[PDB]
Write a protein that binds this ligand. Structure first.
Ligand SMILES: Cc1cc2nc3c(=O)[nH]c(=O)nc-3n(C[C@H](O)[C@H](O)[C@H](O)COP(=O)(O)OP(=O)(O)OC[C@H]3O[C@@H](n4cnc5c(N)ncnc54)[C@H](O)[C@@H]3O)c2cc1C
Ligand SMILES: NC(=O)c1ccc[n+]([C@@H]2O[C@H](COP(=O)([O-])OP(=O)(O)OC[C@H]3O[C@@H](n4cnc5c(N)ncnc54)[C@H](OP(=O)(O)O)[C@@H]3O)[C@@H](O)[C@H]2O)c1
Length: 389
């Protein structure tokens, strides 16, 4: 038991990773798994259940009209509307068309009812793609556009608001180094939607403000669990590895270096390791310097290559850094090296992928058709792994 469904795990430590000279944030959190069945391996993810900000919840109460003190059974033991809006209602994401049909049914204003049925309808698929999805309008924003849509409480949790999803995180710790704590490295998500809403990331803000048992015993806690991933180190340490996680994509790789370090003390020569890390600035964004210098100092990581998004005049990214070490990358690829990419899927991952096609031919001497197939074969061999979100 206790894998599919969550295990209450208090939060032991919660530390800010950036310097006070950084205008962003990134949180180091450790969940205390002592006394639980929870087990994890290097490269795994941890699912974390959180709750909505109180202000968000306050707004949902305003628009629904319910009594928060109303106890009802979410589809045992009942729950209040206020607690269900907090831990079980996805309030801030954009309503699906089926949710708009439900809303429309309880829209007592005929034009509000017509616009909703339209937005869900086929002849509305263009406007629904722009006004709702493109603009990143929440369920809460939509209901404010149609104050007449007053679905009953059953209908709301059954159809309008889907369940608050658990947020997944790459464990940044290895069991050998801390078999009693799950380490998560979590950047603070804080954006403005095209429609001008200011969105606090939901699990990220919880983590950024979680009270750790190392500073109080009312410490925070969250239902958590572990999902097995294929983002795994090679069985043989000797095998050469390439790691390409910048910014917050370092997290898996920190548990890669704890694994082979803990092994190395009792184990064999680890062979070549090269970690490509990128971040904005030396004096702000560099998360886990001293540990990384330590992993370099004691030979856990053979080499460490960094690019600076914005510190320098030149604005280096990691893929650019890869082009500089292209010939060497290719040698490790020919040597049997595994390559890991982790971090932002839409940009870094894509550009890192494109560099790879371009980089193989420099010594591959293959054209795009041939280079494409080669790098595709690395993926089906298991050689080339991507943990991107
Ligand atoms: C395998 C894996 C590993 C991960 N590892 C890490 C990690 O190590 N560190 C880390 O920080 N994160 C990691 N993430 C990302 C993490 O899972 C969450 O996606 C992230 O932390 C979001 O925080 P949040 O839940 O508060 O954000 P959410 O509230 O879910 O917001 C997420 C995004 O939704 C956007 N958004 C806001 N409103 C809307 C709307 N109406 N419609 C559509 N979009 C909207 C926001 O702009 C934001 O970019 C990982 C994800 C995966 C899948
Ligand atoms: N709140 C947020 O976290 C937030 C807000 C807006 C957008 N995003 C997007 O989502 C990503 C998540 O950020 P993070 O937590 O991984 O830290 P980050 O903010 O991405 O910083 C990591 C580093 O990646 C660099 N980078 C940006 N785009 C890249 C690309 N296409 N190829 C290679 N490197 C690139 C960044 O450079 P520069 O930043 O100097 O360009 C930065 O130096 C961001 O990179 C950004 O594109 C995130």
């Amino acid at each position: 038991h206790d894998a599919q469904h969550p295990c209450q795990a208090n939060v032991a430590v919660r530390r800010e990773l950036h310097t006070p000279a950084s205008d962003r944030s990134c949180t180091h959190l450790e969940f205390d798994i002592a006394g639980t069945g929870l087990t994890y391996e290097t490269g795994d993810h941890v699912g974390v259940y959180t709750e909505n900000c109180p202000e968000v919840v306050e707004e949902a109460e305003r628009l629904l009209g319910y009594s928060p003190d109303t106890f009802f059974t979410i589809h045992p033991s009942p729950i209040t509307v206020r607690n269900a809006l907090a831990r079980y209602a996805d309030l801030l994401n954009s309503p699906k068309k089926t949710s708009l049909v439900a809303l429309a049914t309880y829209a007592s204003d005929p034009a509000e009812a017509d616009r909703l049925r339209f937005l869900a309808s086929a002849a509305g698929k263009d406007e629904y793609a722009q006004w709702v999805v493109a603009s990143q309008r929440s369920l809460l924003e939509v209901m404010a556009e149609f104050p007449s849509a007053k679905p009953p409480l059953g209908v709301f949790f059954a159809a309008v608001a889907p369940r608050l999803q658990p947020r997944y995180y790459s464990i940044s710790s290895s069991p050998s180094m801390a078999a009693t704590r799950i380490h998560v490295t979590c950047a603070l998500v804080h954006e403005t939607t095209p429609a001008g809403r200011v969105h606090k990331g939901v699990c990220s803000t919880w983590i950024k403000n979680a009270v750790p048992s190392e500073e109080s015993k009312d410490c925070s806690w969250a239902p958590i669990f572990v999902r097995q991933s294929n983002f795994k180190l090679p069985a043989d340490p000797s095998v050469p590895i390439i790691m390409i996680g910048p910014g917050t994509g370092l997290a898996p790789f920190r548990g890669f270096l704890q694994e082979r370090l803990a092994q190395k003390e009792s184990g064999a020569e680890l062979g070549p390791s090269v970690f490509f890390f990128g971040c904005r600035n030396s004096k702000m964004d560099f998360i886990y310097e001293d540990e990384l210098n330590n992993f370099l100092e004691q030979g856990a990581l053979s080499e460490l290559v960094l690019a600076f998004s914005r510190q320098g005049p030149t604005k280096e990214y990691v893929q650019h850094k890869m082009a500089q070490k292209a010939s060497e990358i290719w040698d490790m690829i020919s040597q049997g090296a595994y390559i890991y990419v982790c971090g932002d899927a839409k940009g870094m991952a894509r550009d890192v992928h494109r560099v790879l096609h371009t980089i193989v031919q420099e010594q591959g001497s293959l054209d795009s058709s041939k280079a494409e197939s080669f790098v595709k074969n690395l993926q089906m061999e298991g050689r080339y792994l991507r943990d991107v979100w």
